[PDB]
Scaffold this active site. Sequence first.
Site, PDB file in Angstrom:
ATOM      1  N   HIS A   1      37.029  47.187  50.769  1.00 47.58           N
ATOM      2  CA  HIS A   1      38.214  47.830  51.315  1.00 47.58           C
ATOM      3  C   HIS A   1      38.267  49.347  51.163  1.00 47.58           C
ATOM      4  O   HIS A   1      38.832  50.004  52.043  1.00 47.58           O
ATOM      5  CB  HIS A   1      39.477  47.232  50.672  1.00 47.58           C
ATOM      6  CG  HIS A   1      40.722  47.428  51.479  1.00 47.58           C
ATOM      7  ND1 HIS A   1      40.759  47.263  52.846  1.00 47.58           N
ATOM      8  CD2 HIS A   1      41.980  47.768  51.108  1.00 47.58           C
ATOM      9  CE1 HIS A   1      41.983  47.496  53.283  1.00 47.58           C
ATOM     10  NE2 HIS A   1      42.743  47.805  52.249  1.00 47.58           N
TER      11      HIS A   1
ATOM     12  N   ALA B   1      59.983  45.156  45.804  1.00 47.80           N
ATOM     13  CA  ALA B   1      60.517  45.140  47.159  1.00 47.80           C
ATOM     14  C   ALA B   1      61.413  46.328  47.477  1.00 47.80           C
ATOM     15  O   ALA B   1      61.869  46.445  48.618  1.00 47.80           O
ATOM     16  CB  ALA B   1      61.294  43.844  47.399  1.00 47.80           C
TER      17      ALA B   1
ATOM     18  N   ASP C   1      42.132  46.962  57.758  1.00 48.50           N
ATOM     19  CA  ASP C   1      40.908  47.388  58.428  1.00 48.50           C
ATOM     20  C   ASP C   1      40.710  46.697  59.771  1.00 48.50           C
ATOM     21  O   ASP C   1      40.065  47.266  60.655  1.00 48.50           O
ATOM     22  CB  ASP C   1      39.704  47.132  57.528  1.00 48.50           C
ATOM     23  CG  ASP C   1      40.004  47.400  56.074  1.00 48.50           C
ATOM     24  OD1 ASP C   1      40.542  48.486  55.772  1.00 48.50           O
ATOM     25  OD2 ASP C   1      39.708  46.528  55.234  1.00 48.50           O
TER      26      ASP C   1
END
Lengths: 247, 312, 315, 314, 314
Positions: free
Chosen positions: C179, C9, C153
């Site tokens: 992807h 993070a 996408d």
Amino acid sequence: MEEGIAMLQLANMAEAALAFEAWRRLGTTQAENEKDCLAIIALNHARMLDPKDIAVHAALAVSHTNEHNVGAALQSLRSWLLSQRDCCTLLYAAVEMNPNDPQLHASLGVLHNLSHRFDEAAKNFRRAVELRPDDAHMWNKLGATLANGNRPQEALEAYNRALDINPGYVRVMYNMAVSYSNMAQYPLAAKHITRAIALQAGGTNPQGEGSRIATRGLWDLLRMTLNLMDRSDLVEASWQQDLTPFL
Amino acid sequence: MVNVAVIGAAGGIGQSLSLLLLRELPFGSTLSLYDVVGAPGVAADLSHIDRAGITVKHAAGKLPPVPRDPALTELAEGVDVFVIVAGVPRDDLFNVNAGIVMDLVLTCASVSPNACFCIVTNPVNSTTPIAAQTLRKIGVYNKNKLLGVSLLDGLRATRFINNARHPLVVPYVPVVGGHSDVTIVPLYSQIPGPLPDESTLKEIRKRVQVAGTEVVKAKAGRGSATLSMAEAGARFTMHVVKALMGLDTPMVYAYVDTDGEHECPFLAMPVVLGKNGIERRLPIGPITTVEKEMLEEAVGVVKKNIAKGETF
Amino acid sequence: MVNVAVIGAAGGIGQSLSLLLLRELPFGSTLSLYDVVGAPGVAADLSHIDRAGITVKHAAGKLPPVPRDPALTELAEGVDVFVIVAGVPRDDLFNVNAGIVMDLVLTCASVSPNACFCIVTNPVNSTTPIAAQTLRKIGVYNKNKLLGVSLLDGLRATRFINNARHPLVVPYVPVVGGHSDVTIVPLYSQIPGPLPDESTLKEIRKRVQVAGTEVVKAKAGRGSATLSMAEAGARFTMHVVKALMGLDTPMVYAYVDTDGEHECPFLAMPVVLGKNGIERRLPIGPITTVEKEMLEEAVGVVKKNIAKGETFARS
Amino acid sequence: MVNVAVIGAAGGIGQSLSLLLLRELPFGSTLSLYDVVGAPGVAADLSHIDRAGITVKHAAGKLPPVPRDPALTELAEGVDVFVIVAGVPRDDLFNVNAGIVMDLVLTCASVSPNACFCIVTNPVNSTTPIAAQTLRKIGVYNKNKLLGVSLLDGLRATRFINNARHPLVVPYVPVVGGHSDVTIVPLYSQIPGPLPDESTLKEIRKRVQVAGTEVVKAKAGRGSATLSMAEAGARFTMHVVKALMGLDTPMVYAYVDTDGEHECPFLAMPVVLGKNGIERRLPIGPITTVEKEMLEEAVGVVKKNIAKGETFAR
Amino acid sequence: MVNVAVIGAAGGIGQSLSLLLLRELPFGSTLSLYDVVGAPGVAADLSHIDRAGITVKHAAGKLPPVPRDPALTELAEGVDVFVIVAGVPRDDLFNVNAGIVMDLVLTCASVSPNACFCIVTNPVNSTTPIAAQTLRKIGVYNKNKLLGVSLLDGLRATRFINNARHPLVVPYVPVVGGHSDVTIVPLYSQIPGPLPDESTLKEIRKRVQVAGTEVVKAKAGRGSATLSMAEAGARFTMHVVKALMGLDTPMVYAYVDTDGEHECPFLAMPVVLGKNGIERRLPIGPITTVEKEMLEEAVGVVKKNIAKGETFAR
């Protein structure tokens, strides 16, 4: 030519510049009266007359650093280096080749000044002025570096001893006024501003548009300094550009 | 139909601020971005998010900075809100930030004089008066159209009082004074509900005052609080944008120019926004004696900061 | 109450993903940030935003990366959603990202086996099967609680078709296949409205296929798309979280395990999210002759990608 | 700033429509209410809701109704959207409704000719052409800003298909044709997801067609569907208002004029709204065979409905 | 996850309250509607609105009212919050409304003893203690689970103060005391910002104490303000529902029971809602001299209202 050379030794420049290699001397003189636009124009004329001149490139770099033009200053420094961060590498290589060159240390200080790294600029300028303690412009640049790096202790060890060398330096009065304003010392700051204005006016009192434009900045600085000390009477008289009440 | 120009969009604060502003701006508005380096890479990063009805504009930077950049002059045409967020990542933090703030405001205000300027740069007590002096120099200056973003103090105070009074929750907390270590005065008296206690509210007030140092120390001196500042700037910019469209009349706390009123020329006081900038400047209101002493002590420091900013 | 843990993070993507999640998590939730470097700094930055009702936790790692970090085992207790977004900023990147994804999934799934895992690191056609292999190795694999975030996408296709067909706006555009580069197959056929024209849909489709490298080209090779990836990850995590507590039953497109159905074991097809993860695998639907060969090539490449991922994961 | 006038606001539909509009209208707008009786009461009722930023006006009615009453003329000044919800609480019903609608449109359009008219009354197929004829008679008729609200069929179709295909949820369903029992055609074919088997999709289409009579039967012949119709009218008016303000460009299905496209002069086809009313009229799209037969019969009925509507207004 | 029952859903307030609850209830909630006459025709009117995730149940009671209706007993199973909006449209109203509230609460609480009760019947000060006494007689009572809706006074006060001071708006205004005429005590000294001077604030407070009769006067005695109370009841019910499942912890002003605190047993003090009903009872706070006098005047009336209610409850 001869009159300008003889006059410049008595610490007065307005008359000498009004009289005006000639381009180089005129521009180097104009850099000392807060007339950076005319000084830069004259330096460009000298450079197009002779790029090989090293003092021309040094003065151009100093003026560009004063003007906050990083690219122009870097280009002028590179031209000066070739006449005799990658520009930083070139300067470091030249310093390593000749570690006893006052010009190299002055160029390093100039390069560090506009890069906001004031500590290295102070180090290089102290080294340079230690090498040559008889140059007023080197102590000028060092004092400007110290003033712009905050903490204006040492009212000044030179640059105000460059005054003992060159009493008539207007940039002296300018930086001392700025530093006095930094320490909230407004009366003598205004006195220094008025002295600088009187030095700019000289005896012939030029009334050119460029001279008035250049002195407008100092007049605005004086007006700002008077506001903080509630001198409305002097502010009102400042609009007429009459320094006689101020003197 | 407003144009929002985020100047300094490729920095740590600017990237998150632009990302937040893209998702909240009204349908039919445009986003303008500018930075010396890294603006193309953010402009062709926010243009891939769908967000129907919003256009993303950008202007490329230049070689090491030049005064009055032509790219900024091209981009700043027809801009309604300016978000000045740019600067270096103690005392040397002021002059470098003041020079670029002067340059940016001089460049932007010449082509768009009737715009709103929100100042997100750091020495907030000192750069807002600088931004006012450089505006006065040009000849155009609206006291109602120049604001200093100080919402982070309110956010922190609200968070710190809500944790000590759970489950009682308040939506905002009034904070006046300035935006520095000792100039932040949280007015916990003017909120509903029983306050926790004395000798405990003092600790919360001190934590609010020195909360910025905590983030810097947590990061081991490697940065500052960028996410919080981005959130606060986005919230304030959304408030200003909504007020300009006539879609709201918010009451906000901003570092504005106290026209008459308080003796300090640039205090942070509650204001009411409108279609023409600031509509009403509300008084501080009733305060307790401890808050009175805190405000009296902070006013002098704010005056010194204003003087230091205006001298340079 | 939902406990969303963001792994990695303090990176470029994780920071904006964490900031976006805090403003959208429902009342009564918690955030558990983790990173080897910079976890406390990002933790004590979102704690100053008011956001009543949401708590923020964190756990810092060690500067020398240690397998099975003791801090992560403590942080991962009582976590419902895992957002695996952790990778270094083609064959030199997979070999360094797959190992860290392996270790992170192995460490997190050893204390919260019933959580759902969202994979946001990039070699997607190849890190979702690796996570499946790790979960099978542990002893607990649930094909309905392992999702690959391929939502980026959808945003690109929607934006491009909306620009081309203004002012007629469509909320979303279906995207199937894979992807990476040529495994993206947008299906503009099954959206309402009069599609612009052929020989113009071709260039839009190709632009969607290679829109990732355009950002890098515009960034002078100094990075990648870090702001839109955060938005896509945050939106997908919001869908999963909302469906987990019973506040929605959304239909999304995610790189998931193809039990039965399509021959390719890990295609990206529409699914319906529910209380237990995935509850309905939907067929692709009608497809034109132009898109049929595109999908054939897509599945042909995805098979090799999955084979490479499994071979690495089994070494 | 927008001005929305709800004619017949004191009726059963009008009160709920006004309440939802007040709760949903954007900041800085104003709400105008008019009715021959009961307008001051509802105006004073809605004024006590806080709703900062919205002002409520009203114009009281008169004695037994007279044509072109001065109250409506005074109130209809500077109005952007006209929502006409006015009708009696099956041919006499049409006659009275047409008579009141013609006068209502004639009165409002004579002071604000550049306003958007949203016909929300029931014989839509016959009242929308009547409104068009009235506007043409005045001399200011704009085909791009005259809408007939037919969103209730879309809501019904969406609800029924979502009940059938749970947990697969769709946001909307395309419905074309008219707004009567046999004239509406739901286009379930152009909907994402696997549709259920046939002989079940037909009993859903039939239910959508006769959904209006179900409410009346459940009410024991006392009233009609007023809550759902009010909600549909509020949603359509909000769409129109947002489109006029520049904050959206939505695609809606409305009973509008067909300049070209379909051979039917007043078919209900998808459109795109904008700052000037109707911006783009999209084609119906690909449909199956049974939907084609349904559209054929619907168009056949709408022909007679339009002919009857325009016959009365002469 | 939550089951909300609206008692009296076919009236004038119940219909709009049910519509507003359907439009705002979360995903996965059920709406139960009951009334003596008209419930079948209201239920099959909101079920035609899509609102995915919401199921609309209903139950119809025999037209001649009977104690312990077998239909209401079945609908009351599994209900989490009850909204009592059943009242016939001074003492000739009080007795019948009290009997209706008694019967309804006795029927509902016998199946769902752990549910929140929101009383929306007009004489709130006298009918909330009646519900409390009925619950006590049944054998189950929770002081944190019985609330009286008095948010309409807050809405009126906020609207009037915003109209008086409008460069500027405020989100809410504290109102304490009770609900009827002189029992309402607005607290304008606790809102942020300058105040619009005395001798005008007096008129504003008087108007808040009187605006209920103004709507009735504007209707020529035909009816009362139904839309405003519908919206206020819907807002309070939404607050309670959201707080019940941990999605909020709001601070609201309601006519609740005071287990200590104030000497009046049923004042309208501020409270904080939570998973178990009332989580915290906050004190009223600092008030000025005129507000103190007004509160002292109001408390005496509240005392006799509670006494009358508990006397009717036998």
